[PDB]
Design a binder for this molecule. Structure first.
Ligand SMILES: NC(=O)N[C@@H](CC(=O)O)C(=O)O
Ligand SMILES: NC(=O)N[C@@H](CC(=O)O)C(=O)O
Ligand SMILES: [Zn+2]
Ligand SMILES: [Zn+2]
Ligand SMILES: [Zn+2]
Ligand SMILES: [Zn+2]
Lengths: 363, 363
């Protein structure tokens, strides 16, 4: 007996096109999304060129419209030069992304004054997301308060961070956050198996106590998002390994396993992979769209999942219970038991749908 | 014709006793203070042992009472273990010091949650000072807001930091700050002369634009404080140079030079070295205490000033106009033209004076 879920949304993926297409492209990354029960993705801007101006966004939109198999929205990225320049295209983007710490990314900012300038100039009704680790969470929260608006914190990975956010929420501050599956299902204890290259990710894998703190504070977690960050094995195993894990194909199976163990409920999962993503990023519904999963099927994660060009996975060898059997996207069968059945280009930019524009007061 | 100033206060000095007495001790450091026209100092807790518990404070109090030539208050330092343990001795200290970045200091904290715990447990009516650089300023400001209290930011050194504080003040937030003379009178341009060892200090020397931004934003600066941080030349020139400059003997002459050039007024100076220190740290007046200075005398800073055991200075070769001629402390001549005339032990702990206790609501 299969369980029907709504179309799930991953608000944090790296699809590497343009410029890193050996790692992933729109076609392979969205195939990976569909296989993981995800029907809508928000693609991060740290591509090559990065999506930091109108011409780069225009290019990315056409690449996505031609390559994507599921629906999508594209982030703009904040740079040291583009504050106050994105107003005409801002509403066409998923939101604005700030990279506030060292990681795989034209996009580190030099000064908190630059963060302020972005918070002041980006339209107030549109989403802002920050990569903000440890004390940087507190710092960007301060900037959000000085500028009287909200912020969404990406991949929370530490007890320190989740408790800070918890304290902010208790004070009524408008902050939301997401947690990635590797920070719920991997820890320092796995670094021996993974090794130092494969194990590179930002935020880094946490201690057992970090992992336990995220589960204990599930009520504080608004969204799950994969931070699908594909790099090839050669890259992960080489002399200067980039940080990141692929995760679209493994996220839902990992979480369904946790549901079957009673670690969270099916509703808890759907709030975090469907409802809260919709409401935080003002993402539209998808007509005639759903995912059928099998919660009984036990399997072991192989050395690589079928679709991502990353062709490796840090979850290799983990036992899971839960499978994506079928995905229907806008009335077409998109995925069945390992076969993707919609072509590159089937996917659409949800920000161009009338119901996908973010409501605003007349300016 | 001499100008009579009130007894000046330096809220940020490192006197190195106990445990680093080859660099400075209470007797030599307070001689340096008097020679610089300073009659009251607040001594930082990063000694050996550090002042992080009642027994260390008790030891430091006796050392200071026996060695100090001018009046003083002693900071407590925050550690990863002492939150919620300092209540009985808190009121006897200058305030609580948090070390939030890498520097010469049992006292880095591991987590912003630890900062929160200190802000929650330290008595609300008593001062808290943070060493907080760059984004850490924003982060500690967030913690202060979550806990609904004030914070004083030590040695602001960057355009980024002063503008962040300016923005916080414009929002009515209770934050004050100080700036040290090296961040007003030295910059990157001096590193060639200083070299990489002598030039080590935290916050590091800023760009010309940082220096210009501090002067332009003088209205935002509540206090000047030396961050007198003596280390010997051998240490500064050796293979692992500690950060810090000695500065008690040079601070007032540098600032008086600026006054004579019309860069700020005598009042601007006295607000920042007397009135604002008093009001932020609840420091008592000193009866029959004053400083006589000569604003006409031109001289060149030598390779070392007479008193500090540091026996070097990064201001060597700078021309100044302005001299401390005489200091009277509580009715005794304490300093005249290079001669200190009060013995070690003349100085007193101002927190033990009835007028030096911080007022509080009945608990
Ligand atoms: N998280 C990572 O380790 N890498 C991400 C960048 C990011 O999300 O910060 C990537 O794009 O490779
Ligand atoms: N500022 C420095 O470079 N050094 C200070 C420590 C401090 O004030 O942070 C010291 O005590 O040596
Ligand atoms: Zn990130
Ligand atoms: Zn990412
Ligand atoms: Zn400091
Ligand atoms: Zn200091």
């Amino acid at each position: 007996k299969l369980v029907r879920l709504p179309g799930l949304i991953d608000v944090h993926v790296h699809l590497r096109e343009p410029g890193g297409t050996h790692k992933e492209d729109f076609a392979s990354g969205t195939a990976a999304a569909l296989a993981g029960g995800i029907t809508m993705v928000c693609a991060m801007p740290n591509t090559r060129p990065p999506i930091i101006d109108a011409p780069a966004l225009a290019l990315a939109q056409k690449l996505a419209e031609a390559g994507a198999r599921c629906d999508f929205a594209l982030f703009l990225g904040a740079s040291s030069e583009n504050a106050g320049t994105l107003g005409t295209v801002a509403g066409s983007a998923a939101g604005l992304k700030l990279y506030l710490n060292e990681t795989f990314s034209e996009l580190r900012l030099d000064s908190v004054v630059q963060w302020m300038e972005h918070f002041e100039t980006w339209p107030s009704h549109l989403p802002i997301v920050a990569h903000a680790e440890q004390q940087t969470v507190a710092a960007v929260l301060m900037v959000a308060q000085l500028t009287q608006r909200s912020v969404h914190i990406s991949h929370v990975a530490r007890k320190e961070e989740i408790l800070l956010i918890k304290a902010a929420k208790a004070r009524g501050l408008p902050v939301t956050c997401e947690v990635a599956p590797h920070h719920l299902f991997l820890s320092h204890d796995d670094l021996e198996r993974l090794g130092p290259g494969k194990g590179e990710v930002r935020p880094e894998l946490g201690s057992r106590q970090d992992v336990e703190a995220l589960w204990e504070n599930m009520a504080v977690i608004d969204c799950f998002a994969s931070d699908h960050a594909p790099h090839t094995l050669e890259e992960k195993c080489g002399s200067r390994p980039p940080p990141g894990f692929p995760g679209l194909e493994t996220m839902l199976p990992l979480l369904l396993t946790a549901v079957s163990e009673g670690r969270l409920s099916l509703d808890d999962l759907l709030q975090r992979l469907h409802h809260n993503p919709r409401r935080i990023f003002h993402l539209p519904p998808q007509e005639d769209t759903y995912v059928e999963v099998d919660l009984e099927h036990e399997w072991t994660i192989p050395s690589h999942m079928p679709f991502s060009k990353a062709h490796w996975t840090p979850f290799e060898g983990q036992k899971v219970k839960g499978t994506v059997r079928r995905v229907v996207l806008r009335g077409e069968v998109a995925y069945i038991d390992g076969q993707v059945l919609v072509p590159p280009g089937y996917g659409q930019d949800v920000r161009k749908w009338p119901q996908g524009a973010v409501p605003q007061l007349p300016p």
